[PDB]
Write a protein that binds this ligand. Structure first.
Ligand SMILES: C[C@@H]1O[C@@H](O[C@@H]2[C@@H](O[C@H]3O[C@H](CO)[C@H](O)[C@H](O)[C@H]3O)[C@@H](O)[C@@H](CO)O[C@@H]2O)[C@@H](O)[C@H](O)[C@@H]1O
Ligand SMILES: C[C@@H]1O[C@@H](O[C@@H]2[C@@H](O[C@H]3O[C@H](CO)[C@H](O)[C@H](O)[C@H]3O)[C@@H](O)[C@@H](CO)O[C@@H]2O)[C@@H](O)[C@H](O)[C@@H]1O
Ligand SMILES: C[C@@H]1O[C@@H](O[C@@H]2[C@@H](O[C@H]3O[C@H](CO)[C@H](O)[C@H](O)[C@H]3O)[C@@H](O)[C@@H](CO)O[C@@H]2O)[C@@H](O)[C@H](O)[C@@H]1O
Ligand SMILES: C[C@@H]1O[C@@H](O[C@@H]2[C@@H](O[C@H]3O[C@H](CO)[C@H](O)[C@H](O)[C@H]3O)[C@@H](O)[C@@H](CO)O[C@@H]2O)[C@@H](O)[C@H](O)[C@@H]1O
Ligand SMILES: C[C@@H]1O[C@@H](O[C@@H]2[C@@H](O[C@H]3O[C@H](CO)[C@H](O)[C@H](O)[C@H]3O)[C@@H](O)[C@@H](CO)O[C@H]2O)[C@@H](O)[C@H](O)[C@@H]1O
Ligand SMILES: C[C@@H]1O[C@@H](O[C@@H]2[C@@H](O[C@H]3O[C@H](CO)[C@H](O)[C@H](O)[C@H]3O)[C@@H](O)[C@@H](CO)O[C@H]2O)[C@@H](O)[C@H](O)[C@@H]1O
Ligand SMILES: [Ca+2]
Ligand SMILES: [Ca+2]
Ligand SMILES: [Ca+2]
Ligand SMILES: [Ca+2]
Ligand SMILES: [Cl-]
Ligand SMILES: [Cl-]
Ligand code: NA
Ligand code: NA
Lengths: 292, 292
């Protein structure tokens, strides 16, 4: 079963993503196929899948930027029916906004079925051009048709996944304790993480004994990423990944405070030095505490 | 012996504080007696006492706002010699900026003796008016003269003192761990702590599930107080007191993130709710983690 999380949803036949046109929160905004850039934030193309209680393999899909929901227009089972963004809520009973999402016969991509109509999300004619219609269409679960097949490229981690990545790192102190603050996190490309750092003012901050020293830099970076998250996205129910760590050197006589992020494959952490914007696989300290 | 820390230094005969006139960093800026407001930040009247290694009861005194040092003009032992702010460093060997500070014969106030001249800091004629001269003057350690006696009202806590205040609180979870980040902290009046909160933008922030929830508010408040500290004071070697706590309710099924500060007497903590600006002796949670 697809796990709760944020996804970039890519057609299996052509490299078009499911895109809420212009990110608009207006009701009836078309959802279309559009090209994308890997290892970026694709601002109009991220979707938060919320599982519905007690209803197997069925979800709402909330666009991260707009806060509005994937909606089959008037629930029609007619082939060609518009799929649009529309106001709703995460656990709605409106079948127009409920989607059963299960693996296709290729075992890798998924099909996306409206719970009311039993029709499928379809990139009409497999058209790869920017702005191509997506519609609800007749189909079957088992058929090959790539117009109706979608890769769910996972862009978030659960808190358990983040904890795993930390735990496999080789620079963790024997006394380490982690303090988990949220449940599901958008993982930033480093290019975005860096942009947040630049825009925070931290690049120009001077180190000062106690009054603006390593701990201040690290906390400020975290606060900046938290502020970015709220100011950037209208959906709720997720956080942005950015940790703080305290660590001690091998000799045991010096401590440091710094940040960390996750690799692209989500399997490992990478340390960030907020005093200079550097990413490091080894910062010279073993973490004894983290919060994220 | 006087402990390292930040002090408001008040004459024992009249309620005038040692004030660096207009907070000016210019060399030769007069240090004068001036009236003060209790339970405020007295912006030009705070002094960081740094003990000198191996030199008993002797200190530099750094004005917190200007970053410049109490300086006996040309080290003269003549009565009437100007005491002024002047550029220097925390561990200087310049005797003009070194001060032996020991209790007076009243056992409560201190006398302040220049290490080079052996003369004493003197509120000339005990004049209580705003801008009254302070000078180096002949004197003795044991005499009663209130012109040369000074109360060192302690405005900072060491990290050990903060840890003690936390440890005597009744709302600490059995699993509590604290993570200390600095050594010496200016304690804010609540009126200042609140002003920082107001100026941070947090009063207008909306709670949002995971993306701007309790943990974000608490971290943001801490970051705001850290930024205020650096932007407000030119001296180094101290931090501003502002903690973050994570806590769990009595039933064990809900957690919260919030801030804390210290009472005026420095002996107890007080919880601050960054979602509404409230101070509470009981926030409804027992702290399982704190960083400060
Ligand atoms: C059958 C119809 O269902 C609901 O209306 C839906 C729309 O539902 C969504 O938007 C409306 C506002 O237009 C409202 O906010 C609702 O809570 C939300 O779920 C929407 O799905 C459109 C497009 O497919 O179709 C229907 O208009 C309900 O509001 C109506 O009263 C009625 O029961
Ligand atoms: C090229 C074409 O691919 C398949 O047709 C698709 C459509 O397939 C879906 O609709 C048809 C009915 O129109 C039938 O229900 C099929 O099982 C279902 O997957 C649909 O994807 C549309 C819009 O994108 O495009 C193509 O017409 C195939 O069935 C056709 O025979 C033909 O090979
Ligand atoms: C004997 C004299 O001592 C030092 O000069 C002091 C001044 O010292 C302070 O300021 C100067 C700049 O004016 C410099 O930054 C120095 O490091 C700092 O300690 C000051 O104490 C004034 C007023 O009392 O008196 C003397 O000018 C030293 O710089 C001189 O070379 C000389 O050794
Ligand atoms: C009212 C006055 O108080 C004392 O005189 C002080 C001064 O005291 C200091 O200087 C005198 C020499 O001028 C002597 O060295 C004394 O031990 C020392 O404390 C001084 O504080 C000045 C400037 O503020 O004011 C007064 O003159 C006392 O000695 C006088 O007899 C007289 O009672
Ligand atoms: C926020 C906005 O994002 C980009 O434009 C989006 C656009 O983004 C996708 O397509 C462009 C090419 O048009 C690139 O492949 C991006 O990597 C994709 O994410 C689409 O989402 C459309 C339709 O909704 O809206 C545009 O606003 C970017 O080109 C803009 O500069 C801007 O940053
Ligand atoms: C930063 C500045 O602080 C206050 O003026 C200071 C002044 O502050 C002291 O005296 C005033 C009365 O003049 C009150 O008692 C304050 O509680 C004291 O802290 C002195 O430090 C003088 C001389 O150095 O400089 C003034 O700038 C305040 O009145 C100003 O509004 C302002 O906030
Ligand atoms: Ca949370
Ligand atoms: Ca600090
Ligand atoms: Ca520190
Ligand atoms: Ca959060
Ligand atoms: Cl088939
Ligand atoms: Cl006497
Ligand atoms: Na830097
Ligand atoms: Na509020």
């Amino acid at each position: 079963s697809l796990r709760r999380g944020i996804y970039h949803i890519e057609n299996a036949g052509v490299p078009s993503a499911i895109d809420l046109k212009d990110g608009s929160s207006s009701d009836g905004t078309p959802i279309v196929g559009w090209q994308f850039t890997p290892d970026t934030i694709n601002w109009h193309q991220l979707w938060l899948a919320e599982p519905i209680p007690n209803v197997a393999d069925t979800f709402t899909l909330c666009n991260l930027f707009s806060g509005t929901y994937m909606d089959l227009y008037n629930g029609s089972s007619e082939a060609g029916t518009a799929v649009n963004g529309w106001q709703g809520t995460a656990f709605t009973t409106n079948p127009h906004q409920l989607w059963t999402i299960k693996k296709s016969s290729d075992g890798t991509s998924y099909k996306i079925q409206n719970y009311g109509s039993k029709t499928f999300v379809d990139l009409v004619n497999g058209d790869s051009s920017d702005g191509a219609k997506i519609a609800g269409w007749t189909g079957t679960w088992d058929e090959g048709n790539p117009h109706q097949k979608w890769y769910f490229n996972r862009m978030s981690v659960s808190s358990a996944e983040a904890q795993a990545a930390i735990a496999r790192n080789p620079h963790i102190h024997g006394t380490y304790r982690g303090y988990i603050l949220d449940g599901e996190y958008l993982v930033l490309p480093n290019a975005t993480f860096t942009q947040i750092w630049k825009d925070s003012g931290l690049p120009g901050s001077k180190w000062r004994e106690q009054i603006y020293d390593c701990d201040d830099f690290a906390i400020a970076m975290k606060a900046a990423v938290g502020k970015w998250g709220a100011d950037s996205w209208k959906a709720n129910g997720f956080a942005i990944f950015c940790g703080v760590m305290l660590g001690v050197n091998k000799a045991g006589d010096a401590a440091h405070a710094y940040n960390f992020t996750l690799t692209k494959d989500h399997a490992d952490i990478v340390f960030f030095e907020p005093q200079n914007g550097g990413y490091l696989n080894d910062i010279g300290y073993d973490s004894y505490m983290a919060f994220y």
